[PDB]
From a paper:
The enzyme CdaA, which synthesizes an essential second messenger cyclic di-AMP (c-di-AMP) in many pathogenic bacteria, has emerged as a promising candidate for the development of novel antibiotics. Additionally, c-di-AMP regulates the bacterial stringent response, further underscoring its significance. The synthesis of c-di-AMP is mediated by enzymes possessing a diadenylate-cyclase (DAC) domain.
To identify crystals suitable for fragment screening, CdaA enzymes from Streptococcus pneumoniae, Bacillus subtilis and Enterococcus faecium were purified and crystallized. Crystals of B. subtilis CdaA, which diffracted to the highest resolution of 1.1 Å, were used to perform the screening of 96 fragments, yielding data sets with resolutions spanning from 1.08 to 1.87 Å. Additionally, we report the first crystal structures of apo CdaA from E. faecium (EfCdaA) and S. pneumoniae (SpCdaA), as well as atomic resolution structures of BsCdaA. Evaluation of the tested CdaA crystals from three different bacteria revealed that the BsCdaA crystals were the most suitable for fragment screening. Consequently, we selected B. subtilis CdaA for the fragment-screening campaign due to the excellent diffraction properties, high reproducibility and quality of BsCdaA crystals. Notably, these crystals tolerated up to 20% DMSO in the reservoir solution, which facilitates soaking experiments. In conclusion, we have demonstrated that a structurally related enzyme from a nonpathogenic bacterium can be used to identify crystallization conditions that yield crystals suitable for a crystallographic fragment-screening campaign.
Numbering used by the authors:
A (entry chain B): 102 to 254
B (entry chain A): 103 to 254
Write the structure that this text describes.
């Protein structure tokens, strides 16, 4: 693999380790991966970080009742660009009625960008992904990893 | 000047984080690299190279989280790394009630010209280690003066 390929795989491993940890602990999380549609307008609503990715930093961001936990983390290639970012809320009727604002925000950004958003439910620990206006719920660890690898292909 | 405004913004971010941690008696260890390079200690932690903000500093030091166990090292107006090793001082002149966090701050200050801020988990007291000495029980004004003197 090229350095770009190695760096992408390290980023995927960091994201999946963080998501898995948060899912087991029922730590709510909202993580958007910017793709080809630029998300600068949303990144600028958050607290700038421009930080190297690590699973440790991703987990620390989402700990309940902390300064960075309320809103979305937006990742740009191999960096955490900003935390506590605003995303627009979807009104789609295909969002399960029991789901709250994190999932609606995720679907909402997926309606106006080609980004991939991961959501961890604070109620159930279930992991979902929003892409292209659709929410895909109850993902296994293997399904999430494959989704990310296919996204970064 | 722009450089002066950036240094002030960083001081404000550090002091806001320190105040929050002191109030909640969150232990913390924050080393500001100066002329002596600290790359060998930076390398022991989790790389960040992040923008400074009070929010990020507070999120790092939350007890029982991946990043809280060690020092944050700042360099060139950024957070270089978290959870870094610092060497323990063997000085017999540190207050005997103080533990490893304070001994680590004094230890790095023995071998570098860095400034290290410590918040005690026992009391929320704020101290600064520099040149092998620990300056204890600082007021907010006292810490700001130290940061401004350091950066002058």
């Amino acid at each position: 693999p090229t350095p770009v390929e190695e760096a992408q795989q390290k980023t995927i491993e960091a994201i999946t380790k963080a998501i898995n940890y948060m899912a087991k602990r029922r730590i709510g999380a909202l993580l958007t991966i910017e793709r080809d549609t630029g998300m600068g307008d949303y990144i600028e609503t958050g607290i700038p970080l421009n930080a190297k990715v690590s699973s440790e930093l991703l987990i620390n961001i989402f700990i309940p009742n902390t300064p960075l936990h309320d809103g979305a983390v937006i990742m740009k290639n191999n960096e955490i660009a900003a935390a506590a970012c605003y995303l627009p809320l979807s009104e789609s009727p295909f969002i399960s009625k029991e789901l709250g604002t994190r999932h609606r925000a995720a679907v909402g950004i997926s309606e106006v960008t080609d980004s991939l958003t991961i959501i961890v439910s604070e109620e159930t620990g279930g992991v979902s992904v929003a892409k292209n206006g659709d929410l895909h719920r109850e993902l296994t660890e293997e399904a999430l990893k494959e989704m990310l690898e296919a996204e970064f292909k």
